[PDB]
Ligand binder design. Structure first.
Ligand code: A1CA5
Ligand code: ZN
Length: 422
């Protein structure tokens, strides 16, 4: 909560604002990433949130914190009016601006008395000069475009009223745009970036429970082949399916690869010491199944994009929950059943607090120590693995919306253990 597991850390005024105006004790990680990128980098965002829950804070918090104006563009009239009501209940001045609004409300908006102004895309397109005046006189913290996938002619819910939003960025090039959508289509996402003319946006995709990922944590034996043989099938050996093994160091990547090659397994390594071309080559041979297993040290699994990854193994404790989340999310993109196993020991590199002693920035040292503790608590836990992840990353509505995976044999090792004999 507060500033605990977030870097850069929210400052005390930011936490106070969150408590006082939104009634929350913590930012979720994606919410902080959006908010911070807006406040400090003035950066465009595309935020895909699978359920739609949790997006409001991303565009409401920044203008409230800095005391300026946020514009929210949406076609969902009744929901916008609802949100205006809720804001005013929290002492946040907000209004829904349209043609029928009085010149006194318009003057109040020009005077900066409203933190959050909701408009339809049609009104917005008809009143660009007003928006520019608000930017010149007060400063627009961000423009939020909800239902942003509606700008795409390739999607099923295109609205003509969204086309003209392409001019926001040319009329207001310094104002960040936060485009929000629930649609998990990569091409719709690219279309949003293109049609809104966003500039190097931060792109985030969150809000999933990933029902086809089975989660398990096992202790290491200390013998690499003894540890990995359960993931192999014999008669010669091979992996059960395409596999990524994440290792915390290049030395361990080389050790693991050497051991697996003793069994003539088709492997490739993948780390930052390689040329961009060499890593592309390994990625391509993995995609076409010339290699069955990639052993990698690259953070987040960046660049390992393959539809049918059936197994992810973390060989050693992961670095922290954010890297773990990104790295196992690489699995099972085709929707078929996959498994994500961590093999760990308390002596693992990513749990060695002595490696943090020399950090000079006190706030960063605390962040790294908190992230180690949180990772270790996950690995040692008896609780549902998926519930731990969703509680850390998602707000409570997302967790409650999850249906049909948690508590079943397909969810995780701890859920399985609570169904079997205990
Ligand atoms: C959502 C985009 S999409 O168009 O639907 N396509 C998609 C689907 C699946 C993917 N797997 C991937 O590796 N990638 C590429 C990178 C991502 O977009 N990663 C996303 C989605 C996958 N993911 C998870 O499933 C994590 C996960 C694991 C276990 C459970 C129980 C739930 C769960 F969600 C990871 C996720 C991701 O890494 N998100 C990044 C942003 C967050 C990082 C952590 C801190 C908060 C922000 C991100 O968007 N990075 C670019 C896809 C693509
Ligand atoms: Zn579970």
């Amino acid at each position: 909560s507060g500033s605990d597991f977030l870097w850069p850390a929210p400052n005390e005024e930011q936490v106070t604002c969150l408590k006082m105006y939104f009634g929350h004790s913590s930012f979720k990680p994606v919410q902080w990433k959006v908010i911070h990128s807006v406040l400090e980098e003035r950066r465009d965002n595309v935020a895909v949130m699978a359920t739609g829950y949790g997006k409001s804070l991303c565009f409401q918090y920044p203008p409230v914190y800095v005391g300026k104006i946020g514009l929210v563009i949406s076609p969902l009239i009744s929901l916008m009016e609802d949100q205006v009501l809720q804001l005013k209940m929290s002492n946040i001045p907000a209004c829904f601006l349209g043609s029928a609004q009085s010149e006194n409300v318009l003057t109040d908006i020009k005077l900066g008395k409203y933190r959050i102004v909701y408009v339809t895309p049609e009104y917005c397109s008809g009143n660009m000069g007003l928006l520019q005046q608000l930017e010149a006189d007060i400063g627009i913290t961000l423009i939020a475009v909800d239902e942003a996938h509606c700008i795409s002619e390739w999607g099923h819910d295109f609205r003509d009223s969204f086309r003209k939003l392409g001019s926001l960025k040319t009329a207001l090039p310094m104002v960040p745009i936060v485009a929000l959508t629930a649609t998990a289509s990569s091409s719709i996402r690219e279309d949003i970036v293109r049609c809104l003319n966003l500039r190097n946006p931060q792109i985030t995709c969150t809000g999933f429970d990933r029902p086809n990922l089975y989660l398990e944590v096992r202790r290491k034996t200390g013998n690499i082949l003894q540890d990995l043989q359960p993931f192999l099938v014999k008669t010669h050996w091979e992996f059960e399916g395409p596999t990524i093994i994440y290792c915390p160091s290049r030395k361990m990547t080389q050790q693991v690869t050497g051991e697996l090659r003793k069994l003539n397994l088709s492997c490739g390594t993948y780390h930052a010491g390689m040329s961009f071309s060499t890593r592309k080559d390994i990625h391509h041979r993995f995609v076409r199944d010339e290699i069955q297993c990639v052993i990698a040290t690259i953070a987040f699994g960046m660049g390992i994009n393959k539809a049918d990854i059936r197994q992810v193994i973390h060989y050693g404790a992961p670095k922290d929950m954010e890297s773990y989340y990104q790295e196992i999310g690489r699995a099972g993109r085709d929707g078929l059943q996959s498994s994500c196993h961590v093999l760990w020991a308390p002596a693992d590199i990513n749990l060695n607090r002595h490696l943090l002693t020399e950090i000079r920035n006190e706030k960063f040292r605390l962040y790294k120590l908190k992230m180690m503790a949180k990772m270790e608590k996950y690995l040692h836990s008896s609780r549902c693995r998926r519930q731990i992840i969703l509680s850390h990353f998602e707000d409570k509505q997302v967790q409650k919306a999850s249906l049909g995976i948690m508590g079943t044999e397909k969810c995780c090792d701890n859920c399985r253990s609570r169904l079997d004999h205990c």
